[PDB]
Amino acid sequence: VEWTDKERSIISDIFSHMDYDDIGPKALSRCLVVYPWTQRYFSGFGNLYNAEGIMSNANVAAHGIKVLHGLDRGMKNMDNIADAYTDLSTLHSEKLHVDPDNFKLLSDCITIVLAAKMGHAFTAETQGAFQKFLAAVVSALGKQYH
Amino acid sequence: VEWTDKERSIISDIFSHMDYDDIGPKALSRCLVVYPWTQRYFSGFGNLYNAEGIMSNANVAAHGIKVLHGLDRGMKNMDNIADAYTDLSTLHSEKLHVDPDNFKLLSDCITIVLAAKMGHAFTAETQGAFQKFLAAVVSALGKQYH
Amino acid sequence: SLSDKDKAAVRALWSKIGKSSDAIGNDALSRMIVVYPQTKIYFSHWPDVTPGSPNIKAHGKKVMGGIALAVSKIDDLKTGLMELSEQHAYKLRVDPSNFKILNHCILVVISTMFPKEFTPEAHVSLDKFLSGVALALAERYR
Amino acid sequence: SLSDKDKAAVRALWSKIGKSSDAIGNDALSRMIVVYPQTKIYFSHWPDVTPGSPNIKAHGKKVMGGIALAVSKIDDLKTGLMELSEQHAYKLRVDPSNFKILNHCILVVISTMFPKEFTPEAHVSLDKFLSGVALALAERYR
Numbered sequence: 408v409e410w411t412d413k414e415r416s417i418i419s420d421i422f423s424h425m426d427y428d429d430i431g432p433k434a435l436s437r438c439l440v441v442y443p444w445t446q447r448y449f450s451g452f453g454n455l456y457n458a459e460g461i462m463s464n465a466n467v468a469a470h471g472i473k474v475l476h477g478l479d480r481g482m483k484n485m486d487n488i489a490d491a492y493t494d495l496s497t498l499h500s501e502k503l504h505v506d507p508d509n510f511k512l513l514s515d516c517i518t519i520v521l522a523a524k525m526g527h528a529f530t531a532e533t534q535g536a537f538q539k540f541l542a543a544v545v546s547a548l549g550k551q552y553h
Numbered sequence: 554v555e556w557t558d559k560e561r562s563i564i565s566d567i568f569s570h571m572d573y574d575d576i577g578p579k580a581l582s583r584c585l586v587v588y589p590w591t592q593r594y595f596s597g598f599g600n601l602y603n604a605e606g607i608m609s610n611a612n613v614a615a616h617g618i619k620v621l622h623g624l625d626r627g628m629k630n631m632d633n634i635a636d637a638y639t640d641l642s643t644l645h646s647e648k649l650h651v652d653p654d655n656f657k658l659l660s661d662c663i664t665i666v667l668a669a670k671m672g673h674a675f676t677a678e679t680q681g682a683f684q685k686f687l688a689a690v691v692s693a694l695g696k697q698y699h
Numbered sequence: 700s701l702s703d704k705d706k707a708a709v710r711a712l713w714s715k716i717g718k719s720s721d722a723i724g725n726d727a728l729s730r731m732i733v734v735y736p737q738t739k740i741y742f743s744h745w746p747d748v749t750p751g752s753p754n755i756k757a758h759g760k761k762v763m764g765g766i767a768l769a770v771s772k773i774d775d776l777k778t779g780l781m782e783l784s785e786q787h788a789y790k791l792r793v794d795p796s797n798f799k800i801l802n803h804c805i806l807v808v809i810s811t812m813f814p815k816e817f818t819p820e821a822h823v824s825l826d827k828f829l830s831g832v833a834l835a836l837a838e839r840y841r
Numbered sequence: 842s843l844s845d846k847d848k849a850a851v852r853a854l855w856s857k858i859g860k861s862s863d864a865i866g867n868d869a870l871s872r873m874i875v876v877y878p879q880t881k882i883y884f885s886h887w888p889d890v891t892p893g894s895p896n897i898k899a900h901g902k903k904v905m906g907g908i909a910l911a912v913s914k915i916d917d918l919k920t921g922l923m924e925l926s927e928q929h930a931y932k933l934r935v936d937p938s939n940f941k942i943l944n945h946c947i948l949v950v951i952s953t954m955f956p957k958e959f960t961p962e963a964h965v966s967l968d969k970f971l972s973g974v975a976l977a978l979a980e981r982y983r
């Protein structure tokens with residue numbers, strides 16, 4: 408990816424103002440509810456019953472934070488996203504067997520939760536930079552096997 | 554992509570026995586019929602009426618052959634698929650604005666037409682190597698913009 | 700397909716946000732054109748195809764009007780949106796991958812404007828409904 | 842949705858190839874497992890999950906039986922396949938991206954066996970029908 412300096416600043420501002428303890432749990436929760444077949448990939452999580460089980464399940468929360476922290480690493484290394492994600496790409500698309508289409512679903516849920524937090528500050532241009540970022544990360548997560 | 558020597562031989566045998574004048578026109582024809590919104594991207598092609606217009610349209614044929622010849626170049630350079638496709642990736646995903654999902658549709662039509670030509674010789678393992686090839690080519694065609 | 704529960708949640712949500720549908724349509728369409736540049740070719744005939752644009756504003760009013768129509772025809776989307784499926788999928792040959800893009804941007808825009816009302820429960824049903832729309836719009840392609 | 846023309850072409854095709862459905866199901870399932878290895882986890886409980894396999898053979902008979910059921914229930918796929926949607930999408934939580942994969946492999950296998958009958962006209966209608974199946978199977982997820 409060829410990044411602009413405007414894109415670098417937007418992406419950096421975004422991450423710098425994000426509360427990982429708030430966004431990660433809500434993004435993952437929501438993804439497990441809106442696209443419930445994704446619950447299947449999470450072995451050992453507990454009582455995943457209804458919608459308010461998932462929403463206040465501390466294991467899903469814990470894990471929502473690990474996802475945002477995994478994004479945090481690509482943000483810190485934007486010129487080398489592809490190779491900072493070999494570990495994760497290998498676990499997700501060869502030890503977990505998660506269909507590539509799902510990284511795209513979760514990424515859409517992070518965007519929706521981030522739009523509800525930032526409100527009007529989440530402009531089209533902000534959205535355009537964050538989306539370019541995540542498409543790079545999603546690209547790096549499947550990258551391993553064809 | 555990490556290729557095996559068995560994969561290299563399969564892919565090479567396949568291409569070496571293919572009639573481009575037969576496969577390319579049938580693959581593209583079929584794609585324009587099964588997924589007719591793809592006809593939209595082809596400006597100046599002529600009388601694209603019904604299904605037997607498309608099937609015997611010499612312009613669609615001509616163009617089916619250019620697609621197989623474009624695949625021919627990645628076959629000849631498998632360790633560097635990504636960079637042999639910058640020209641094409643740039644035209645398709647920035648001058649033509651073809652949605653990435655469509656390279657996947659056409660690639661599925663080439664496989665179906667190739668399975669009907671090879672018959673029983675088109676085994677699961679043969680299919681597995683050809684599919685890995687085309688997923689690499691498809692990956693290289695969108696590669697340009699996110 | 701939608702359940703009576705899905706139908707009721709869509710009607711109640713639309714009931715809450717439908718006042719601001721003109722701003723929702725302008726905003727969602729602005730974002731599709733900026734964030735997903737491959738979609739700009741369908742509106743290349745307009746003189747101004749940037750977020751401020753008078754044309755985006757007028758056309759976003761029309762798109763939210765088509766959504767309002769899908770809400771009132773929620774029990775048979777296929778028939779309710781047949782004229783629009785004809786227009787897009789037959790005439791303009793809009794490539795259907797693009798309907799999921801516009802639907803995503805509508806969700807982002809609603810989330811941006813009604814974070815409190817856009818709960819996860821409201822999101823599952825709105826998402827099933829919007830995919831029912833995309834599917835109804837894709838009816839006339841083939 | 843399918844037209845009376847689509848329905849008739851599916852019935853006529855199935856009429857021509859349905860004799861060999863046991864071989865079609867074994868072959869299509871073998872190929873999904875080899876070419877799309879991410880799908881092998883749903884059958885990890887079988888001792889042998891390679892193309893020759895006695896288990897793949899027995900289960901491919903069953904899958905082609907579900908297709909034969911969809912053909913006979915072609916006018917209401919949603920209701921005709923509700924028990925199977927329950928099984929996959931509720932119990933096994935099979936990820937729906939996988940239904941398009943199995944459908945692709947069935948088309949490859951039919952193409953391999955009946956190149957003459959698998960014309961482009963037959964392919965559009967068989968493809969609309971198979972997507973109607975995938976959609977009917979996805980009914981119980983949410």
Ligand code: HEM
Nearest residue numbers: 445448449473474476477478495503505509510511513514
């Ligand atoms: C798209 C962006 C994603 C990112 C950045 C991401 C990143 C991560 C990270 C950082 C972990 C922590 C595990 C460790 O430290 O070993 C993890 C675990 C995991 N993720 Fe993802 N992930 C993403 C998407 C997904 C999706 C869409 C799924 C679908 C189910 C998924 C399923 C899993 C599973 C099953 C685990 C393993 C947890 C365990 O060990 O029980 N991930 N991921």
Ligand code: HEM
Nearest residue numbers: 591594595619620622623624641649651655656657659660
């Ligand atoms: C997926 C594998 C594909 C390959 C290898 C491929 C390759 C090619 C090649 C080699 C050309 C010749 C043009 C030249 O010499 O300048 C071409 C043209 C073109 N292709 Fe593709 N293509 C692929 C898929 C697609 C798809 C899915 C579409 C969707 C419509 C598409 C649309 C076009 C268009 C619009 C042109 C331009 C023809 C013109 O200049 O009028 N291609 N492509």
Ligand code: HEM
Nearest residue numbers: 738741742761762764765766786787791793797798801802
């Ligand atoms: C939620 C999905 C959509 C809805 C409800 C919708 C609704 C509408 C409506 C109500 C009109 C006006 C029809 C008329 O003036 O006769 C229209 C026109 C149009 N739509 Fe859509 N549409 C949708 C998706 C899309 C997408 C995804 C695209 C392309 C990326 C698109 C491209 C167009 C174009 C190019 C026009 C004509 C405008 C002009 O000629 O100035 N539509 N649509």
Ligand code: HEM
Nearest residue numbers: 880883884903904906907908928929933935939940943944
């Ligand atoms: C064309 C789409 C499909 C059809 C018609 C179909 C049909 C069937 C049928 C008839 C059964 C037997 C039910 C029973 O024994 O009660 C079955 C079981 C099963 N299906 Fe499918 N299926 C389809 C797609 C898939 C896909 C894509 C997967 C996963 C990749 C899958 C995974 C399974 C599994 C794991 C079983 C249980 C077998 C066992 O427990 O040994 N199915 N399916």
